[PDB]
Motif scaffolding. Structure first.
Motif, PDB file in Angstrom:
ATOM      1  N   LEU A   1      -9.411   9.218  -1.967  1.00  0.00           N
ATOM      2  CA  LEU A   1      -8.226   8.801  -2.701  1.00  0.00           C
ATOM      3  C   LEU A   1      -7.997   7.291  -2.572  1.00  0.00           C
ATOM      4  O   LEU A   1      -7.778   6.609  -3.572  1.00  0.00           O
ATOM      5  CB  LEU A   1      -7.025   9.603  -2.191  1.00  0.00           C
ATOM      6  N   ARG A   2      -8.087   6.759  -1.346  1.00  0.00           N
ATOM      7  CA  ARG A   2      -7.887   5.334  -1.077  1.00  0.00           C
ATOM      8  C   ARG A   2      -8.839   4.484  -1.904  1.00  0.00           C
ATOM      9  O   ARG A   2      -8.396   3.497  -2.470  1.00  0.00           O
ATOM     10  CB  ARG A   2      -8.093   5.019   0.404  1.00  0.00           C
TER      11      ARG A   2
ATOM     12  N   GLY B   1       7.974   9.524  -5.776  1.00  0.00           N
ATOM     13  CA  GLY B   1       6.700   8.836  -5.627  1.00  0.00           C
ATOM     14  C   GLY B   1       5.670   9.545  -4.745  1.00  0.00           C
ATOM     15  O   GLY B   1       4.601   8.980  -4.537  1.00  0.00           O
ATOM     16  N   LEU B   2       5.943  10.746  -4.233  1.00  0.00           N
ATOM     17  CA  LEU B   2       4.932  11.619  -3.630  1.00  0.00           C
ATOM     18  C   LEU B   2       4.411  12.650  -4.639  1.00  0.00           C
ATOM     19  O   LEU B   2       5.112  12.994  -5.590  1.00  0.00           O
ATOM     20  CB  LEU B   2       5.517  12.357  -2.417  1.00  0.00           C
ATOM     21  N   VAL B   3       3.240  13.236  -4.379  1.00  0.00           N
ATOM     22  CA  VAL B   3       2.755  14.448  -5.067  1.00  0.00           C
ATOM     23  C   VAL B   3       2.109  15.402  -4.084  1.00  0.00           C
ATOM     24  O   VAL B   3       1.602  14.971  -3.053  1.00  0.00           O
ATOM     25  CB  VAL B   3       1.785  14.162  -6.225  1.00  0.00           C
TER      26      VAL B   3
ATOM     27  N   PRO C   1      -8.372  10.878   7.253  1.00  0.00           N
ATOM     28  CA  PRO C   1      -8.091   9.628   6.564  1.00  0.00           C
ATOM     29  C   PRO C   1      -7.769   9.857   5.086  1.00  0.00           C
ATOM     30  O   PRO C   1      -8.391  10.691   4.431  1.00  0.00           O
ATOM     31  CB  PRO C   1      -9.357   8.783   6.701  1.00  0.00           C
TER      32      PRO C   1
ATOM     33  N   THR D   1      -4.800  10.973   3.569  1.00  0.00           N
ATOM     34  CA  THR D   1      -4.081  12.231   3.307  1.00  0.00           C
ATOM     35  C   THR D   1      -2.572  12.161   3.491  1.00  0.00           C
ATOM     36  O   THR D   1      -1.903  13.179   3.443  1.00  0.00           O
ATOM     37  CB  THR D   1      -4.646  13.395   4.108  1.00  0.00           C
TER      38      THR D   1
ATOM     39  N   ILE E   1      -1.658  10.871  -8.269  1.00  0.00           N
ATOM     40  CA  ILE E   1      -1.541   9.692  -7.407  1.00  0.00           C
ATOM     41  C   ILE E   1      -1.989   8.439  -8.145  1.00  0.00           C
ATOM     42  O   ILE E   1      -1.255   7.456  -8.143  1.00  0.00           O
ATOM     43  CB  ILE E   1      -2.363   9.798  -6.117  1.00  0.00           C
TER      44      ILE E   1
ATOM     45  N   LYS F   1      -0.404  10.650   5.951  1.00  0.00           N
ATOM     46  CA  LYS F   1       0.273  10.693   7.256  1.00  0.00           C
ATOM     47  C   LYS F   1       1.147   9.469   7.463  1.00  0.00           C
ATOM     48  O   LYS F   1       2.296   9.594   7.867  1.00  0.00           O
ATOM     49  CB  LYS F   1      -0.747  10.792   8.386  1.00  0.00           C
TER      50      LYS F   1
ATOM     51  N   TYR G   1      -6.660  16.334  -0.605  1.00  0.00           N
ATOM     52  CA  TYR G   1      -6.274  16.488  -2.005  1.00  0.00           C
ATOM     53  C   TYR G   1      -7.379  17.069  -2.876  1.00  0.00           C
ATOM     54  O   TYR G   1      -8.549  16.711  -2.745  1.00  0.00           O
ATOM     55  CB  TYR G   1      -5.836  15.133  -2.553  1.00  0.00           C
TER      56      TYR G   1
ATOM     57  N   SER H   1       0.791  -1.239   0.000  1.00  0.00           N
ATOM     58  CA  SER H   1       0.000   0.000   0.000  1.00  0.00           C
ATOM     59  C   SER H   1       0.829   1.299   0.000  1.00  0.00           C
ATOM     60  O   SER H   1       0.356   2.318  -0.491  1.00  0.00           O
ATOM     61  CB  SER H   1      -0.962  -0.049   1.189  1.00  0.00           C
ATOM     62  N   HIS H   2       2.097   1.260   0.433  1.00  0.00           N
ATOM     63  CA  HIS H   2       3.052   2.385   0.371  1.00  0.00           C
ATOM     64  C   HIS H   2       4.269   2.145  -0.533  1.00  0.00           C
ATOM     65  O   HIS H   2       5.229   2.903  -0.504  1.00  0.00           O
ATOM     66  CB  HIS H   2       3.508   2.740   1.785  1.00  0.00           C
TER      67      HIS H   2
HETATM   68  N1  LIG Z   1       1.107  12.799  -1.088  1.00  0.00           N
HETATM   69  C1  LIG Z   1       0.956  11.494  -1.344  1.00  0.00           C
HETATM   70  N2  LIG Z   1       1.748  11.027  -2.281  1.00  0.00           N
HETATM   71  C2  LIG Z   1       1.617   9.725  -2.545  1.00  0.00           C
HETATM   72  N3  LIG Z   1       0.743   8.873  -1.983  1.00  0.00           N
HETATM   73  C3  LIG Z   1      -0.063   9.416  -1.076  1.00  0.00           C
HETATM   74  C4  LIG Z   1       0.012  10.707  -0.708  1.00  0.00           C
HETATM   75  N4  LIG Z   1      -0.886  11.051   0.249  1.00  0.00           N
HETATM   76  C5  LIG Z   1      -1.534   9.892   0.454  1.00  0.00           C
HETATM   77  N5  LIG Z   1      -1.059   8.868  -0.353  1.00  0.00           N
HETATM   78  C6  LIG Z   1      -1.491   7.491  -0.391  1.00  0.00           C
HETATM   79  O1  LIG Z   1      -2.601   7.302   0.484  1.00  0.00           O
HETATM   80  C7  LIG Z   1      -2.692   5.899   0.796  1.00  0.00           C
HETATM   81  C8  LIG Z   1      -3.084   5.681   2.278  1.00  0.00           C
HETATM   82  O2  LIG Z   1      -2.044   6.060   3.196  1.00  0.00           O
HETATM   83  P1  LIG Z   1      -2.136   7.432   4.021  1.00  0.00           P
HETATM   84  O3  LIG Z   1      -0.793   7.889   4.461  1.00  0.00           O
HETATM   85  O4  LIG Z   1      -2.909   8.449   3.274  1.00  0.00           O
HETATM   86  O5  LIG Z   1      -2.966   6.925   5.209  1.00  0.00           O
HETATM   87  P2  LIG Z   1      -3.453   7.984   6.237  1.00  0.00           P
HETATM   88  O6  LIG Z   1      -4.923   8.130   6.181  1.00  0.00           O
HETATM   89  O7  LIG Z   1      -2.863   9.347   6.187  1.00  0.00           O
HETATM   90  O8  LIG Z   1      -2.904   7.234   7.483  1.00  0.00           O
HETATM   91  P3  LIG Z   1      -3.871   6.763   8.602  1.00  0.00           P
HETATM   92  O9  LIG Z   1      -4.869   5.809   8.066  1.00  0.00           O
HETATM   93  O10 LIG Z   1      -3.041   6.060   9.602  1.00  0.00           O
HETATM   94  O11 LIG Z   1      -4.539   7.930   9.247  1.00  0.00           O
HETATM   95  C9  LIG Z   1      -1.320   5.287   0.444  1.00  0.00           C
HETATM   96  O12 LIG Z   1      -1.466   4.498  -0.735  1.00  0.00           O
HETATM   97  C10 LIG Z   1      -0.479   6.534   0.192  1.00  0.00           C
HETATM   98  O13 LIG Z   1       0.647   6.346  -0.653  1.00  0.00           O
END
Ligand SMILES: Nc1ncnc2c1ncn2[C@@H]1O[C@H](COP(=O)(O)OP(=O)(O)OP(=O)(O)O)[C@@H](O)[C@H]1O
Ligand SMILES: Nc1ncnc2c1ncn2[C@@H]1O[C@H](COP(=O)(O)OP(=O)(O)O)[C@@H](O)[C@H]1O
Ligand SMILES: Nc1ncnc2c1ncn2[C@@H]1O[C@H](COP(=O)(O)OP(=O)(O)O)[C@@H](O)[C@H]1O
Ligand SMILES: [Zn+2]
Lengths: 443, 434, 48, 36, 146, 434
Positions: free
Chosen positions: F383-384, F27-29, F61, F63, F354, F65, F346, F6-7
């Protein structure tokens, strides 16, 4: 020299020969009807007649209910068990709440059992197997006894011993100039080590040298040994004579407390009655003192109904500063002193009362002259005025930090300026509570 | 160059409790600033601890979050120094899963009393150069080397068995207590660290000992009173001093230790050095735990307690009852209360300089001005967290002394609780639950 | 019991099933290896 | 047994591995080796 | 009659998991450092127990002077596992009777010139009236521990 | 190949040489203002000076983190410990909550130890042992690259003997550590008998003697746990190790002091060096108020790792306070001890980037008009959820015989696999049937 507690001045109840209470004696002040009542409880305990009679020292925080319960321990003296507790001790994680009460009900009863210790000990100077002049028919030689020579710093003598001893004298690696002992009630021989006389015969040897014994080769004393019935309960519940697989396994594993059965208590009561009837063992019933009884659960209180009624039980002392609180382990149910009405029916309540200012000044003086602190009369009058504005445990307690401040400021006694300086440095509960309420949005 | 394991923590700058000999606190010294009333009070209890004359004393250091309550305690711990025990726990460390809340406090108390002992010894200590024996009882010799001498011992019948059962070899370094006869290998001598070319699964090289070979001396030990309780709890109880398996020690042991240690203190064989128990965030204790402190503060050998707490008039845990500090009144009049006071701008600028002195950071006086405002419009401990990040932005920016532009940059990157709360409310229903 | 396809694994499990060492086996079986060394000749004693 | 060195009353602790004399301390070890 | 006797097929570990898969084996080089960086090394015990800087200074292992334990016995007891526990326990059962005699009949002055402790004087578990040495020495108390 | 997690696409923060965020890199945006702050945290952790300093990633959720906290681990690389934990791991049955925090604080500090791994392997040509009958063992080793004689100490030979080694076995010796492995008999002896119960192996084709410089990574928690309970020392072969179950236990701060004092000794000797790392606490709002009140000591402690907390809850009740609402599910008194990095929702124009970064990572080829649609459905949901459709859509595209995603695949999957907000309609309509 010894360091001083919150109660070290409490030397007794300080009663008259008639059982009345003096205004100030044995380190206590006031509470006269409660000291008179504890006088009756000291007679109750000293009589040994009763089981499970119980008292509740009721009264506000800092009114002396813990002091009177410890004063009873001085009036009894150390010869009978006084077993202190707080209600919070019952919350074990190893063993159920009601069993921690039962253990304290069994710590508050002592055997006092007397026995002879007799032992032969000394540096072994000879082993001399004494043959008879004729063997019995068909044998090459026969020994009627082994002579053992023993010595101590007082003298030497031979002992004559049964021939079966000789195996034990090579089980133990005995050789002349060892120091050894033999239990006269059992005939087993044990080795302590090479005698200290020989410590210079090498530059190194792999054994600790034992100092040459003193007093005679044969020793006797009678000794009076005290065990609570809880010591008997434990020693029967977890044996220590570990020459078997169960005992070694049980002694390498964690030494977990266990819920001892009503049957073991039964069998021990059946045996100590034998030894009290045979005049071997005295019994000394004593006191179980629980401070902070309001911490017990309604499960624990509803166990004390059986425990305080049981014809074995100690005298019991309870204390509680609480008012009309809820009984712990229920949501709604309020009861006086935090103690359920049906338990509170079973206890002789002793009322303890607030001090008047002129008693506080007398208590503070007794604390000062036992903490080791000398104070001026105008400073003491101010310190009793602080007591009047606050509570005894604040006003008593300023004495030592006032003594440090006086010592640092070059004076060997407390004076007025020290008490008002310490009162500016340190708040009490009633003054601090106002400071919280004036700032409640910031905490 | 090399970073030690101990390094710059949230209180690293305090190196005492800055007081003149009269217990007059200075405006800034020993890394502490301000709090003049609470630092007199801390100095007075620090002298009470150093006397040790009395038992079951307690102090509560009360006051607002971010006003130095843990700082006064972790400062006082260093003005007291080593040589006297200072057990520090957070209040939630006592909620063990293998012992009661009253045992975990009893062990925390007993770990704060130091029994000092004198002990007389002789130890031999050196590289064994060779071992020699006759062959029949056996008689033999062995040679010890130390940096100052090479020497030989005539040794007894059981010693030869002990050396040969312990499998010593030439060039091993050993120590023996002569009074006890017990052998101990330390390792192989460093000048010997090549005579084998694959090494057994445990071996270690040590530099060969120095000075006299058979040192004869008395030594002083400090043993915390809790260890004397643990060592008696079961036949090999001392392993629990490290494994933590100290599962509810029987009260019959602790009262035997008090009797024995009081007997030693009268005979003069030992001296009881009273320490401190500091329960940081004491408001976390249960009513069943505070009601145990009410008796623990009355033993003839309790420590001095110190406590700290952020709570207003607040609910005591495990009850509905509200009291000052979240502590019951029946403990609060046993306590003697010290109150800490919020910082002025003057004190706030002084402390932010002492953090920069400790973090090894230079700031513009414009930057200290802006930082002090931020640390006064928002909590002190947030401004203390900006300055490290300002140093790291300044390094990345190729600067050297941090400027207002670097502070405003970090202040835009890292939020405090107020700006975080406000921007959370600007998207509120996207977060989970309220 | 665990089977394995390896000559050294066989030795480790064989040695375990024999009882892992003469010290550890005597320690459980006879109470200490000193008590095993005694047991063999306590055979001949009058008051073992 | 006592220290070889003439001025020393202390018991023998060991002997010198070089010279063979009975000894009691580093002080007597120096004193012996600086006259043998 | 006798219990129904059952034997499941032995649990099969592959040659691969046996050779490469055991952390006690594939990580043995790292495991040596867990044994070397240890305060239970006899070297570190000596360096803490006898080579302090301060007169008063806070040393662990101070109790090994008052239990009868060598620094190498502490090390062996920590690093050789339950066999060293069991044998050291059996030797402590032997030693308890030897300690009890001296502890219950020796009473002059003090351990040296009316000052200092002595080896074994943290082992107070013998002093109880009901400890196995004192109980074995006292035939009335023996009968109360049945 | 490695499985697509997932990451698995985030490979760093993607900052420029000034520490500003690139619009899409590594791999971030998007998300820039938090990525630039994590740049400061990576420079903080790489600077080593700090102890117990901490960060809170706060935001909805889906975003980033968890993604940015893993990006920090990727900017540091394998050499600096990053310890991931969920706050929900704290609730053990074998140890208290305020121990699991201290174990995880001790997992996030590494020693970094260098040694030359030195392996001897081959057929043993001879074993010959050289007091009288023991000294040390000469051994000969042979391979299809040559021969050597080694000079093994008797404590190595005790392991050759325990392994039941004889002349003609194939052996691996690790000369640092005395790891000795029998590897079967050399197959030149595979006719000693016609059938015998030994595995026969070919004479090694490799060098007899291999040196590698190797680096051991070992946390302070490994040192604590490997010392606090008496070690196994029982490599099967010893049935005493069967009876006593190796439970976890509350390691005492009485031991950890000695482990710190020993680590100081070895890093002062330069035998090891220290890499203070990160502890990462996902779901920090899941910690009890007792655990938060322990962090008020742990984050202050002058040894502690850097700590990163992540939360997505609003103004909810603090877990285990039964009443007290506070931001991020964290007590205000801890929320004032952390630097807060806020995280942002986002726009559709980030989500398209993404989904493309996911597609090209996950092995998908996607048509721009399907990617437009995964953009659009992302605007309606999360996004998820959009990212989750890619493999399902690809897997239908594969079955329908197209090697790329097109509109009808994603439009079918959208009707086949509901998102949360779609199901929350169904559960309100069909309400009384669940
Ligand atoms: N800026 C980003 N660039 C790339 N991928 C991102 C980005 N922001 C979120 N994602 C993607 O969002 C998906 C879920 O992970 P994310 O870090 O968003 O969980 P989260 O909601 O912030 O964490 P948690 O569930 O613990 O609160 C992953 O596939 C991650 O790569
Ligand atoms: N009658 C008394 N005479 C002298 N000192 C007393 C007396 N009663 C109490 N004290 C002092 O006041 C303190 C508070 O009373 P105490 O019994 O200890 O608390 P509590 O009433 O809450 O149980 C005592 O510890 C002791 O210092
Ligand atoms: N008087 C002081 N002098 C120096 N540093 C202080 C002082 N007061 C507070 N600090 C520092 O400010 C921060 C907050 O103080 P602290 O005692 O930890 O707050 P709290 O009492 O709420 O727990 C810490 O970094 C601490 O070291
Ligand atoms: Zn001489």
């Amino acid at each position: 020299t010894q360091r001083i507690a919150s109660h070290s001045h409490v030397k007794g109840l300080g009663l008259d020969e008639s059982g009345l209470a003096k205004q100030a004696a044995s380190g206590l002040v006031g509470q006269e009807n409660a000291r008179e009542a504890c006088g009756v409880i000291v007679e109750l305990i000293k009589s040994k007649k009763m089981a499970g009679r119980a008292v509740l020292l009721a009264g506000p925080p800092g009114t002396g209910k813990t002091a009177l319960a410890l004063a009873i321990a001085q009036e009894l003296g150390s010869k009978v068990p006084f077993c202190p507790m707080v209600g919070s001790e019952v919350y074990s994680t190893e063993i159920k709440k009601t069993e921690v009460l039962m253990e304290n009900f069994r710590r508050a009863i002592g055997l006092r059992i007397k026995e002879t210790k007799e032992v032969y000990e000394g540096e072994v100077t000879e082993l001399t197997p004494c043959e008879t002049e004729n063997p019995m028919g068909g044998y090459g030689k026969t020994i009627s006894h082994v002579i053992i020579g023993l010595k101590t710093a007082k003298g030497t003598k031979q002992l004559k011993l049964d021939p079966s001893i000789f195996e034990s004298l090579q089980k133990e690696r005995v050789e002349a100039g060892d120091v050894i002992y033999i239990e006269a009630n059992s005939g087993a021989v044990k080795r302590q080590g090479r005698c200290d006389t020989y410590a210079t015969e090498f530059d190194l040897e792999a054994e600790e040298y034992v100092p040459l014994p003193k007093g005679d080769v044969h020793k006797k004393k009678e000794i009076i040994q005290d065990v609570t019935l809880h010591d008997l309960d434990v020693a029967n519940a977890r044996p220590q004579g570990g020459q078997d697989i169960l005992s070694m396994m049980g002694q390498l594993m964690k030494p977990k407390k266990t819920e001892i059965t009503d049957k073991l208590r039964g069998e021990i009561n059946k045996v100590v009655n034998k030894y009290i009837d045979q005049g071997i063992a005295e019994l000394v019933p004593g006191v179980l003192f629980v401070d902070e009884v309001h911490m017990l659960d309604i499960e624990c209180f509803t166990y004390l109904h059986r425990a305080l009624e049981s014809s074995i039980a100690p005298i019991v002392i309870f204390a509680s500063n609480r008012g009309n609180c809820v009984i712990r382990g229920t949501e709604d149910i309020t009861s006086p002193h935090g103690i359920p009405l049906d338990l509170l029916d079973r206890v002789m309540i002793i009322r303890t009362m607030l001090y008047t200012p002129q008693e506080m000044k007398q208590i503070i003086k007794i604390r000062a002259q036992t903490e080791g602190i000398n104070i001026s009369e105008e400073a003491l009058n101010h310190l009793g005025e602080i007591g009047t504005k606050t509570t005894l445990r604040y006003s008593v307690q300023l004495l030592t930090p006032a003594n440090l401040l006086a010592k640092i400021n070059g004076k060997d006694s407390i004076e007025k300026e020290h008490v008002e300086e310490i009162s500016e440095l340190f708040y009490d509960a009633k003054s601090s509570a106002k400071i919280l309420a004036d700032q409640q949005d910031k905490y | 160059d090399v970073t030690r394991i101990e390094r710059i923590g949230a209180h690293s700058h305090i190196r005492g409790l800055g007081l003149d000999d009269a217990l007059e606190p200075r405006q800034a010294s020993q890394g502490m600033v301000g709090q003049l009333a609470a630092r007199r009070a801390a100095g007075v209890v620090l002298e009470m601890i150093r006397e040790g004359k009395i038992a079951g004393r307690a102090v509560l250091i009360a006051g607002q979050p971010g006003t130095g309550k843990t700082a006064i305690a972790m400062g006082m711990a260093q003005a007291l120094g080593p040589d006297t025990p200072f057990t520090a726990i957070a209040g939630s460390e006592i909620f063990s899963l293998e012992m009661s809340k009253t045992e975990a406090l009893t062990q925390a108390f007993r770990r704060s009393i130091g029994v000092r002992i004198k002990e007389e010894t002789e130890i031999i200590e050196g590289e064994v150069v060779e071992i020699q024996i006759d062959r029949p009882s056996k008689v033999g010799k062995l040679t010890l080397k130390t940096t100052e001498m090479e020497t030989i011992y005539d040794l007894g019948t059981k010693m030869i068995e002990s050396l040969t059962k312990d499998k010593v070899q030439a060039g091993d370094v050993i120590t023996i207590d002569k009074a006890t006869g017990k052998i101990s290998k330390l390792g192989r001598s460093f000048t010997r660290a090549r005579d084998y070319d694959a090494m057994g699964s445990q071996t270690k090289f040590v530099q060969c000992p120095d000075g006299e070979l058979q040192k004869r001396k008395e030594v002083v030990h400090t043993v915390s009173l809790h260890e004397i309780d643990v060592i008696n709890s079961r036949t090999q109880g001392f392993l629990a001093l490290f494994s933590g398996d100290t599962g509810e020690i029987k009260s019959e042991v602790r009262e035997q230790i008090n009797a024995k240690v009081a007997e030693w203190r009268e005979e003069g064989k030992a001296e009881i050095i009273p320490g401190v128990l500091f329960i940081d965030e004491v408001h976390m204790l249960d009513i069943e735990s505070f009601s145990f402190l009410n008796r623990a503060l009355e033993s003839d050998m309790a420590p001095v307690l110190i406590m700290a707490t952020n709570r207003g008039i607040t609910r005591i845990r495990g009850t509905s009852y509200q009291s000052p500090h979240g502590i019951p009144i029946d403990l609060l009049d046993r306590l003697l209360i010290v109150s800490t006071t919020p910082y002025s701008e003057k004190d706030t600028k002084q402390i932010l300089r002492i953090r920069c002195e400790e973090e090894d950071v230079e700031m513009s006086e414009d930057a200290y001005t802006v930082l002090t405002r931020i640390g006064l419009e928002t909590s002190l401990r947030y401004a203390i967290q900006l300055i490290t990040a300002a140093s790291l932005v300044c390094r990345k920016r190729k600067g050297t002394e941090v400027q207002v532009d670097d502070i405003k940059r970090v202040y835009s990157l890292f939020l405090d609780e107020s700006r975080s709360t406000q921007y959370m409310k600007e998207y509120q229903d996207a977060f989970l639950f309220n | 019991d665990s089977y394995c396809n390896d000559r050294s694994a066989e030795y480790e499990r064989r040695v375990l099933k024999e009882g892992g060492s003469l010290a550890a086996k005597q320690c459980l079986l006879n109470g200490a290896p000193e008590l095993a060394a005694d047991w063999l000749n306590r055979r001949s004693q009058f008051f073992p | 047994p006592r220290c070889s060195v003439p001025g020393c009353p202390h018991p023998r602790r060991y002997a010198c591995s070089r010279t063979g004399q009975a000894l009691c301390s580093l002080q007597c070890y120096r004193i012996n080796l600086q006259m043998r | 009659w006798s219990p129904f006797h059952i034997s499941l097929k032995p649990y099969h570990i592959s040659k691969f998991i046996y050779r490469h898969g055991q952390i006690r084996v594939f990580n043995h080089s790292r495991d040596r450092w867990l044994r070397v960086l240890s305060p239970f090394a006899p070297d570190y015990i000596q360096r803490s127990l006898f080579h302090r800087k301060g007169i008063n200074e806070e040393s662990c292992f101070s109790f090994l002077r008052f239990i009868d334990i060598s620094p190498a016995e502490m090390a062996n007891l920590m690093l050789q596992g339950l066999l060293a526990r069991w044998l050291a326990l059996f030797l402590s059962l032997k030693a308890s009777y030897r300690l009890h005699q001296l502890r219950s009949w020796g009473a002059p002055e003090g351990e040296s010139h009316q000052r200092y402790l002595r080896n074994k004087d943290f082992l107070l578990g013998v002093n109880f009236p009901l400890s196995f040495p004192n109980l074995c020495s006292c035939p009335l108390l023996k009968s109360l521990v049945f």
